[PDB]
Design a protein around this ligand. Sequence first.
Ligand SMILES: Cc1ncsc1-c1cc2c(cc1F)[C@@H](NC(=O)[C@@H]1C[C@@H](O)CN1C(=O)[C@@H](NC(=O)C1(F)CC1)C(C)(C)C)CCC2
Lengths: 104, 89, 141
Amino acid sequence: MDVFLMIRRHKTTIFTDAKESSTVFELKRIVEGILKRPPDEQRLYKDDQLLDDGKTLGECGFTSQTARPQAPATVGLAFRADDTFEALCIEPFSSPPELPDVMK
Amino acid sequence: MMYVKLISSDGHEFIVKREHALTSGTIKAMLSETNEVNFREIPSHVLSKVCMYFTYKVRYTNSSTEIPEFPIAPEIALELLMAANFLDC
Amino acid sequence: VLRSVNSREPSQVIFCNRSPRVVLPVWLNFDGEPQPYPTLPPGTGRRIHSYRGHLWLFRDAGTHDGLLVNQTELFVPSLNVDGQPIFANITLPVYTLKERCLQVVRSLVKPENYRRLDIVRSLYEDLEDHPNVQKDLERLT
Ligand SMILES: Cc1ncsc1-c1cc2c(cc1F)[C@@H](NC(=O)[C@@H]1C[C@@H](O)CN1C(=O)[C@@H](NC(=O)C1(F)CC1)C(C)(C)C)CCC2
């Protein structure tokens, strides 16, 4: 069962897929391969909840029917900048304009 | 795998698999020699939907399995169309 | 050119809507004219009586958007083997992003106000060209 995810840190957004049986650590290995920073310097989050590396994505709520290809689930990323880890910050996308009158 | 970066007009950088992005010949030509492509006229709330469409197309092309609708919120429907019209997606 | 063969040979078919759209079944008569049939709500299946050699295409009932039957545009009932009816599986095609956006905007904008939108005139012309079975049949031929 494939799950589709957005790993988001600041204005960086990674679109990727994994298995529901895959662990958070494998997701971190993918993030390492992309952004070149080791898993021990990474911290992953579902909402405001820290994710343990040993748990599978399904246990942490990432199921194939909530993490859809046409509607992927959001996974927050936080990096260790120095001795301390940074706070979880995900910059929101731009806001759409007001709906035109002809569509309203 | 191989990843490329697509930057919106408002600075959001989306990292997507190369194979998923190469479905569009527009992105394929825009790459050629580069793994980074900047879209100065496409905002993030539209380009994110574009990447979602990339994933959706790669997953559901050639499926007997019931294909779900691709959702488009009204508030972005216009701009996405323009983006699509400019990229032939 | 595209027309049904008057075989007079029966073939029982299962119209299976595996799409989230209200499906209109269109049979092509012996003269090549599209004929509308009763609609199917989303996720529903009907057992019909049709004939071998007959031509069927499937549309969105409200918008006339093209739909796929058994992963192709046209369905022709065949011989029933061991009393088993023939499945016609109506699914959503993988639309281009432009066609999906056009569908959404058409569903949101009255045809009167297409020109009032702030888009390129090319796109007005594209909006007005909303799905039509006859033009699709002509191009096919
Ligand atoms: C319930 C329903 N929900 C979605 S659709 C549907 C449906 C319902 C019905 C038919 C077809 C349908 F989809 C009906 N079935 C047909 O009308 C079939 C379809 C096509 O094969 C043509 N046809 C015929 O009977 C034609 N007859 C012949 O060709 C000959 F008998 C000389 C050989 C016709 C010229 C009388 C129209 C039967 C009555 C009800």
